[PDB]
Amino acid sequence: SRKTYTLTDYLKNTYRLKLYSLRWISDHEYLYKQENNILVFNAEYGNSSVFLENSTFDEFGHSINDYSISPDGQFILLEYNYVKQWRHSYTASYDIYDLNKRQLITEERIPNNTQWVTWSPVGHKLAYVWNNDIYVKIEPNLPSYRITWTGKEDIIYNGITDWVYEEEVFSAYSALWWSPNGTFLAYAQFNDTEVPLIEYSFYSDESLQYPKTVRVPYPKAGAVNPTVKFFVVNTDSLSSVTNATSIQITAPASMLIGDHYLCDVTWATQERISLQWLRRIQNYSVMDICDYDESSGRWNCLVARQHIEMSTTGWVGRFRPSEPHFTLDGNSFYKIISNEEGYRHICYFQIDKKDCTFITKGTWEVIGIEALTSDYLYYISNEYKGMPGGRNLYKIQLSDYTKVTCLSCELNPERCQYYSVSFSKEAKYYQLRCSGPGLPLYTLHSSVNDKGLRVLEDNSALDKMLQNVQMPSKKLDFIILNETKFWYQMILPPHFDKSKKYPLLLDVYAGPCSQKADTVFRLNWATYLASTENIIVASFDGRGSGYQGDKIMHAINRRLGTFEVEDQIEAARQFSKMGFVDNKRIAIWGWSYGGYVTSMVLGSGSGVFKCGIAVAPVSRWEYYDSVYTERYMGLPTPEDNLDHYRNSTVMSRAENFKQVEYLLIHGTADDNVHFQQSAQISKALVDVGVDFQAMWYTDEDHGIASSTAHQHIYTHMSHFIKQCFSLP
Amino acid sequence: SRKTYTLTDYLKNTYRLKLYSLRWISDHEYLYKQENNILVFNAEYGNSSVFLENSTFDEFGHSINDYSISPDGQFILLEYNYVKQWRHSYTASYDIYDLNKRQLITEERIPNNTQWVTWSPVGHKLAYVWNNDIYVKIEPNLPSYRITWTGKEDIIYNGITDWVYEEEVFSAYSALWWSPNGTFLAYAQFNDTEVPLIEYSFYSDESLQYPKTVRVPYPKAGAVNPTVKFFVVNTDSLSSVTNATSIQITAPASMLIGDHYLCDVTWATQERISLQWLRRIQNYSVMDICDYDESSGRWNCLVARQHIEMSTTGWVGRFRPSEPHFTLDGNSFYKIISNEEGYRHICYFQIDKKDCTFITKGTWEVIGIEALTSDYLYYISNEYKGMPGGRNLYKIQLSDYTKVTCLSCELNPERCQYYSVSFSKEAKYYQLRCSGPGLPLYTLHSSVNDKGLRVLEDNSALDKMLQNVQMPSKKLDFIILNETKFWYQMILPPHFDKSKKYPLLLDVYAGPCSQKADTVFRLNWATYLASTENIIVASFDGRGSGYQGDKIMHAINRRLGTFEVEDQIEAARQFSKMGFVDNKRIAIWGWSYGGYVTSMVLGSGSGVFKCGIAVAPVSRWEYYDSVYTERYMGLPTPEDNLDHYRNSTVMSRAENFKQVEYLLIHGTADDNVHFQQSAQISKALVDVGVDFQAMWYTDEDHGIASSTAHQHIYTHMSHFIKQCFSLP
Ligand SMILES: COc1cc2c(cc1OC)[C@@H]1C[C@H](N)[C@@H](c3cccc(CF)c3)CN1CC2
Ligand SMILES: COc1cc2c(cc1OC)[C@@H]1C[C@H](N)[C@@H](c3cccc(CF)c3)CN1CC2
Ligand SMILES: *[C@@H]1O[C@H](CO)[C@@H](O)[C@H](O)[C@H]1NC(C)=O
Ligand SMILES: *[C@@H]1O[C@H](CO)[C@@H](O)[C@H](O)[C@H]1NC(C)=O
């Protein structure tokens, strides 16, 4: 008799999850936004002052998009005129408000259309990139020093990443790294000179008489890649009428032999930088440790302290080689490395030494190292109750590795099984963040004894509202295939009845190192399909999926669109053999890799599925970018992996599609997985005479996420599934 | 008759209409291809010979796409390596084969990738266009003479047409015109330097890693048009030492004022040429008559013989100024003109004299003038039975205009109401060819006493098959709207029953000077929908339709998307009132102009239609080309017609679509109505929250004509209509 969770609810965001986003500023204080004021909180004691009043910048004259405060709290960056580029990149204008004053600084502004800006870690230095060149401001009201002069649109990138690096390597537009002193500005430089361009139409507003052609350097599988150089400049010795001296750091000779990438830049100390490089064949990676020479003003990367990481079974790292966390003195670090068994654990490295010591071990994985002090290392793992889909915060005594405390496990075991954390400087305090399976809970904790201090946000407003709606529930369990556990989740309709036969939607991503079965609380489309349409929405984590060792994750190595595909079919077959699913009403849908697999399934002939929706699918690996594809597939050459590059296309299975109802969707402005991918799927389905359904989305990219397109695609998909399942 | 006409029947060409394609080669002889041999028939004696054996080119080694026999039957052109460009343009390889000797010409072969070749109308000279330049060959085995040197890809076109001229002016790739002598080669030269480029992606075979960007000079409404220059070259005076002196004929001073077009090129005598020119505001045109000046070498156009053709109510001509037909001596001509009551009749022009004399009159129009002799002019009109959708050959005595004989009206009055004709060189014999309402009937005649000579193909084979098929029947009637007659046709299901209530698909095109209500016999998609699905397919010829005089055609002037839309709604509203129509099941669909009108109807909020289909619709006139658009719309400037350009978009009506079910389809390589047009529609619909269906056809142009795409689109549209009308 209660109201149901409707498509409108989802779409108009009727029930919002509350968050508590803070930024640690010291060892003991953080910044937080309350009713549009910026507040400072004291962690120990809970009291707050107003840092920046809401009503300041009422007469500023521009809508303010973000803020950024100098480490040494004298200035604030006001970001405005944000215009998005790709996933991380954007262009904006900037002003500086001088805080120890009433005033915006008016001389020597950061240019309009700046590509990236950063404060140094200490004081108030600024580094920014504008027109692909680096600049440095020692003082907010003084002129900038030009660090680089080679910048050119689409060709040379100084201190920002190009398209593949943004997307596939740094997950960041920025390629600037200040030393912890603020003394040295390290930076990468990318050269896209010979990198082929993907081109596509942008239609824009009606008034645009002629369509624009967007041209983006984008190395497809096997094409010419960008090249990299690394540089470190001394920020303390810049001259106004002498050009700045950038000292280059050369990649290791074992990388310079052929094509390679920069992977990681981590400062170790005031005079030591850590650099990881990875070979185009993502088999082999090297970490270089480089010290600054006070004599020659040069950097020296002693071959003696180089570190190597290879994999016999797949590629290095989860998506890239993991980052090292150095001890205060910089002579040793910790790093997540896959062990002999295939499980990702914490290894202790010493700088001038050759092997590493494993600090954790077991039939589970460390997800990330979050903090390091002289006494403990803090990490997040899925160790608790052997649930790969859970996440908890642990703590190790470094005096003794066997002495391990779980810090979040027993806090709220029913509500809370999916943590992430955020420590203050030197880890005096941490904010725990519970993500499910109950409602998100945010707490603040004190490290000295691990005593809880304060609940920060408990989403009790949402709980009150949710009591009045017929919410679905979540099953998280596993099946056994050829003697191995493989988890799935089920979003079950309210008042579920095990004797009744429900329609089932298989929700797939299934890309490498993915996890679709976890313990987080979500309000999404699947919430609606269960609460209102009584549809079971199922996800399954099969071979190739992450966080359960390399035996599972790498199964897929050099062979995408293979085991991950068969295994979604099997999960389906098996969900079928439980008594509460109507085996005449099983759909499948996914987005991105999700659309590829959905497409490869629908094209398998299993006869298991009635219909499926693919949104923005990869159709052929030679269409996707090089860093991603080659990481799992090698090069598409007859001496490497051409053969399976060809066997694993959506196109090759066109015939089989006559057995199923197919909905194909793609935004026309997809820089990521180009419209071409769906273009070739539809053309091949046409060539064979297979009817299917389509929908392009003008000027939308990979997220199809503009407000109206978001509502449209979900409405469209709701109809298609409702009609596939014969639901009113 | 048990078996029904299937969607498969239309798609697979189960019921072939036979045709009879001859090419006259003198006054008394013609060539015909029967199976794969070339046969010459005698028209006087009926007897025949084999000209060219089918097996003649067995060991040639290229699949021949076409032949062209020279006027003196000495040589044959062989066309292979055919690649289509636009509607008329294409590139090909050519050989010449000496017929007298039985040899291949090896020396000085016409180059690969030729854009156009043509014999002279007499003898065996060749003019061809390669890489945008004109070449001439006196002897098929001799070095060619380079006429022009200025030709540059997408910029300068010598003797061929750019995109707009091809599609909207000459309906040809060719821009060459030999004098009847074979002495003179005249050619136009087009300048696209400043014409903006339409840019779209082409995806090609799967194997193409990166999509290609096709770039085409295409002036949209209001943009910078190409420029035109006209030249004449003396073929007889060419030197292999010196260069070719081309002599320029420039436009009239009344043209050179602003933007203009070279409208028409019609030779008069061996030494006289007629040119028409059209102003950019296409309501003013001018005919220039130009004589060769024996001794000086130039060409001269006396302003005395200049003839003005303008319009007060619309544009000049049907799609252009009509073509002149000269009498042997070349001092006079006949040409169709709108008369003081707005109907299109033949006029007698004497070269030096003011006005012209009308030789035909009445409330019908002459469709075309087909031949001229000393004593008679033959023409085609829709006079018979006061019927605009009919077409009949007539005869007019020149020494007495009141002696009008209908050569065809009575020949087969129930089977044939729609003829076209093909006279011999000097009109001694003509092949009539009728297209309906019954099956196509091809008959030869002698002009002398208009004696019926022979039956050439009568489609008897097809006739028997069809008795075995539950054929639909065509009803071609009219309705009185204001106090005017607007014609409609109706395709009716077999065993039609005037008391049962049928679903109706309103078939629409309705572009200016269109006619969808006629007496043609068609085996098409409307045939299958009526035969198999018992849907009525109606079409209506409302305001803007042609062949009924300017009072109807020009109603739409400076005003597209208004009257021609309101009238289609009206039509269906009337069709509703007729008791055989189920008024909850009316659909509309259309291609090109049709798609725009369908969309505008669907967006009108009339309440009459349940669903529509729109294929490659125009959506906004600023997106379609200048030549066609400004003809009907004027310029998109505030001081001309910008307001109505803006009041007539599909986009602005978007809200209204929540009321109907919309299927919108477009090919991504449509160089004509650019994909852009639907892209902007889709985006409007998304912006306003309206669901609809969509389908793109990748790499298909405006016709969506490739056999797999063609079969695909009608299959897809079938299901759509079937489901809209609740039919299994
Ligand atoms: C922890 O870090 C990372 C996580 C993740 C990504 C990258 C990451 O770091 C580079 C990649 C980036 C990649 N571009 C994404 C994508 C988008 C479109 C199409 C495909 C292929 F199907 C893949 C998939 N994700 C998975 C999640
Ligand atoms: C007897 O001659 C001619 C007839 C006709 C045409 C041209 C003709 O010759 C110039 C025009 C050419 C025009 N380009 C076509 C078209 C194509 C796409 C979009 C639109 C606008 F909606 C219009 C329609 N047709 C109608 C039939
Ligand atoms: C980038 O690389 C190209 C060769 O691909 C080279 O010619 C050019 O000098 C390089 N530019 C810079 C500034 O490194
Ligand atoms: C018709 O036959 C006659 C009689 O032999 C011959 O002169 C002539 O070539 C023939 N015409 C054709 C076109 O075959």
Break chain A into its structural domains and give their ranges: 1-13+468-728, 17-459
Chain A residues lying within 8 Å of B201, measured CB to CB: 199-201, 675-676, 679
Distance CA A368, CA A361 (A): 14
- B555: phi then psi, degrees, rounded to nearest 5: -70, -25
Assign 3-state DSSP to chain A and report helix, strand, coil percentages, each to 5: 20, 40, 45
Ligand 4 atom at minimum distance from B48 CA: 14
Q: How far is CA B32 from CA A15, A207, B36, B273, in A?
A: 77, 53, 10, 32
C-alpha span between B685 and A143 (Å, rounded): 50
Q: Are strands B325-326 and B332-338 parallel, antiparallel or unpaired?
A: antiparallel
User: What is the nearest CA distance from A712 to chain B, expressed in angstroms?
Assistant: 6
Torsion of CA B309, B315, B316, B321, to 10 degrees: 140
Report DSSP letters for A31-67, one per residue: EEEETTEEEEEETTT--EEEEE-TTTTSSS-S-EEEE
Chain A interface, mutation test: which of B695, B697, B722, most A Cβ atoms within 10 Å?
B695
CB contact under 8 A, A211 and B196: no
Q: Could you give the angle at which helices A593-602 and A563-576 cross, rounded to 10 degrees?
A: 70
- Pocket lining: B44 vs ligand 4, CB cutoff 6 Å: no
Which residue is listed with tokens 């640690």?
A24
Are B206 and A695 in contact (CB < 8 Å)?
no
Residue nearest to atom 22 of ligand 2 (CA): B593
Kindly state the tokens that stand for A524.
Answer: 């999404």
Q: Which two tokens stand for residue B319?
A: 């799609």
Structural contact between residues B681 and B613, judged by C-beta atoms closer than 8 angstroms: no
Are residues A709 and B686, on separate chains, in Cβ contact within 8 Å?
A: yes
- Structural tokens at position B660: 């109907």
So which residues of B are the catalytic ones? 592, 670, 702
Main-chain dihedrals φ then ψ at residue A652, nearest 5 degrees: -60, -15
Return the structure tokens found at B439: 């099956």
Query: Which residues in chain B are closer than 8 Å to A712, comparing Cβ atoms?
Result: 686, 689, 691
Option in A651, A686, A716 nearest B712 (CB): A686
Gap from CA of B668 to ligand 1 centroid (Å): 29
Residue A166 phi/psi, 5° resolution?
-50, -55
Dist. CA A191 → ligand 3 center (Å): 6
Q: Where are the beta strands (DSSP E) in A99-166?
A: 104-105, 116-119, 126-130, 133-137, 145-146, 156-158
Q: Cβ(B432)–Cβ(B443) under 8 Å?
A: yes
Cβ-defined contact of A201 to B716 (cutoff 8 Å): no
Burial degree of A329 (CB within 10 A; 0-12, 13-18, 19+)? exposed
- Is residue A702 among the annotated active site residues? yes
Q: Which residues pair with A392 in a beta bridge?
A: A381
Tokens of A510: 């299934």
Handedness of CA A214, A220, A225, A228 (dihedral sign): positive
**Closest residue of B to A215, CA-based?**
B213
Between CA B530 and CA B715 the distance in angstroms is: 15
Q: Where are the beta strands (DSSP E) in A363-483?
A: 366-372, 376-381, 392-397, 400-406, 419-423, 429-434, 441-446, 451-457, 473-481
Q: Can you give the length of chain B in residues?
A: 728
Confirm if B523 and B17 have CB atoms less than 8 A apart. yes
Pick the residue from chain B with its C-alpha nearest to A711: B689
Residue B503 distance to chain A (closest CA, Å): 24
Q: How many CB pairs under 8 A join A and B?
A: 120
In the reported structure, the alpha carbon of residue B26 is separated from the centroid of ligand 4 by a whole-number distance in angstroms of: 14
Q: CA B117, CA B243: separation in Å to the nearest integer?
A: 21
Q: Which chain A positions have a beta carbon within 8 Å of B679's beta carbon?
A: 201, 203, 668, 696, 698-699
Residue A651's closest chain B neighbor by CA? B206
Atom of ligand 1 nearest to the CA of A617: 22
Which two structure tokens, joined as six digits, stand for B565? 């839309």
How would you list the strands of the sheet with B451-457, edge to edge? B419-423, B429-434, B441-446, B451-457
Residue A521 · residue A527 · CB < 8 Å: no
Residue nearest to atom 13 of ligand 1 (CA): A168
d(CA B548, CA B539): 16
Q: Which ligand is nearest to the CA of A703?
A: 1
B573 in helix, strand or coil? helix
CB atoms within 10 A of CB B529: 28
Nearest CA to ligand 3 atom 1: A191
Whole-number Å distance, alpha carbon B451 to ligand 4 midpoint, is 21
Method: X-ray
Q: Which of B22, B31, B49 to mutate to test the pocket of ligand 4 (most atoms within 8 A of CB)?
A: B49
* B719:A674 CB<8 A: no
B206: nearest CB among A620, A698, A711: A620
Q: E strands of B18-70, at which residues?
A: 22-24, 29-34, 37-42, 48-52, 66-69
Binary contact (B689, A711; C-beta < 8 A): yes
- Whose Cα sits closest to atom 1 in ligand 4? B47
**Edge-to-edge strand ranges of the sheet holding A429-434:** A419-423, A429-434, A441-446, A451-457
The Cα of A686 is separated from the nearest Cα of chain B by a number of Å equal to 6
Q: Which residue has the tokens 């006493």?
A: B449
Q: Please work out whether the CB of residue B31 comes within 6 Å of at least one atom of ligand 4.
A: no
Q: Are B121 and B110 in contact (CB under 8 A)?
A: no
Q: Do A715 and B691 touch (CB under 8 A)?
A: yes
Ligand nearest to the CA of B45: 4
Would you say the CATH fold of B17-459 matches that of B1-13+468-728? no
Instruction: Show residues of chain B in contact with A717, CB under 8 Å.
Output: none
Residue B351: name the closest of B374, B369, B330, B378 by CA: B330
Query: Phi and psi of B644, rounded to 5°?
Result: -75, -30
**Most informative mutation of B592, B596, B630 for ligand 2 (most atoms within 8 A of CB):** B592
Ligand nearest to the CA of B51: 4
Q: How close is the Cα of A194 to the center of ligand 3, in Å?
A: 9
CA dist B500 → B4, B492, B535, B728 (Å): 20, 12, 12, 19
Q: How far is CA A680 from the centre of its chain?
A: 28
Contact between B505 and B493 (Cβ < 8 Å): no
Q: Which residues are CB-contacts of B365 (< 8 A; sequence separation ≥ 6)?
A: B336, B343, B344, B345, B381, B382, B547, B548, B549
Among A676, A689, A694, beta carbon nearest to B696: A694
Residues within 6 Å of ligand 3 by CB: A 150, 156, 191, 193-194
When scoring B195, B678, B686 by the number of chain A Cβ atoms within 10 A, the one with the most, hence best to mutate, is B686
* Nearest residue of B to residue A664, measured between CA atoms: B695
The sign of the dihedral angle between the CA atoms of B640, B641, B646, B649 is negative
Closest residue in B to A201 (Cα–Cα): B200
Cβ contacts of A201 on chain B, cutoff 8 Å: 199-201, 675-676, 679
Query: Which CATH number is associated with domain A17-459?
Result: 2.140.10.30
**C-beta separation of A597 from A563 below 8 A:** no
Please indicate whether residue B43, judged by its CB atom, sits closer than 6 Å to ligand 4.
no
Q: Which of A98, A141, A93, A150 is nearest to A116 (CA)?
A: A93
Fold of A1-13+468-728: Rossmann fold (3.40.50)
Q: Are A92 and A83 in contact, with CB atoms under 8 Å apart? A: yes
Query: Is A539 annotated in the active site?
Result: no
Residue matched to tokens 């004894």: A449
- Bridge partners for B404 per DSSP: B396
Closest CA to B387 of B511, B477, B484: B477
Exactly one of A545, A592, A626, A718 is catalytic; which is it? Answer: A592
State the DSSP H helix or E strand holding residue B576, giving kind and residue range, or none if neither.
helix B563-577
State how far the Cα of A38 lies from the Cα of A76, in Å rounded to an integer: 11
